[PDB]
């Protein structure tokens, strides 16, 4: 959120209205979510033995 | 007669405002214009908060 705010400081200096700034991130955020939803793969096809390993992948990431 | 001072009787209380003028009303308009200035840029979709 600070990164969006820091980059917005330079655009306020150029004289862009804040609503056009806010609408730009809203269209960009949904566009990025729409792309990342396509590229990620599903893990439900694997059995329970490999599904336990995916939790170990995320468990070691969070700890 | 009961006192050497003889205080002059004020009509209203001390600290009670007195208000006669062609103005007076201009201050009320400027007071409304002051509050109106705060709500001025909040109009329309391209406004502010």
Swiss-Prot record, chain A:
Function noted in UniProt: Molecular chaperone; assists the folding of proteins upon ATP hydrolysis. Known to play a role, in vitro, in the folding of actin and tubulin. In yeast may play a role in mitotic spindle formation.
Subcellular location: Cytoplasm
Family label: Belongs to the TCP-1 chaperonin family.
Subunit note: Heterooligomeric complex of about 850 to 900 kDa that forms two stacked rings, 12 to 16 nm in diameter.
Natural source organism: Saccharomyces cerevisiae (strain ATCC 204508 / S288c) (Baker's yeast)
Protein name: T-complex protein 1 subunit epsilon
Part of the full-length chain shown: 126 to 188 of 562
From Swiss-Prot, chain B:
Localization of this protein: Cytoplasm
Subunit annotation: Heterooligomeric complex of about 850 to 900 kDa that forms two stacked rings, 12 to 16 nm in diameter.
Annotated family: Belongs to the TCP-1 chaperonin family.
Purpose: Molecular chaperone; assists the folding of proteins upon ATP hydrolysis. Known to play a role, in vitro, in the folding of actin and tubulin. In yeast may play a role in mitotic spindle formation.
The protein's name: T-complex protein 1 subunit eta
Protein species of origin: Saccharomyces cerevisiae (strain ATCC 204508 / S288c)
Originating gene: CCT7
Residues of the full protein shown: 2 to 50 of 550
């Amino acid at each position: 959120a600070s990164a969006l705010l820091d980059q917005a400081l330079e655009l306020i200096q150029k004289g862009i209205h804040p609503i056009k700034i806010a609408n730009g991130f809203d269209e960009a955020a949904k566009l990025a979510i729409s792309k990342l939803e396509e590229t990620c793969d599903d893990i439900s096809a694997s059995n329970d033995e490999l599904f336990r390993d995916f939790l170990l992948r995320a468990a070691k990431t969070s700890l | 007669n009961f006192g050497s001072q003889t205080p002059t009787i004020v009509v209203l209380k001390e600290g009670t405002d007195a208000s006669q003028g062609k103005g007076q009303i201009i201050s009320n308009i400027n007071a409304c214009v002051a509050v109106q200035e705060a709500l001025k840029p909040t109009l329309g979709p391209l406004g502010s908060d």
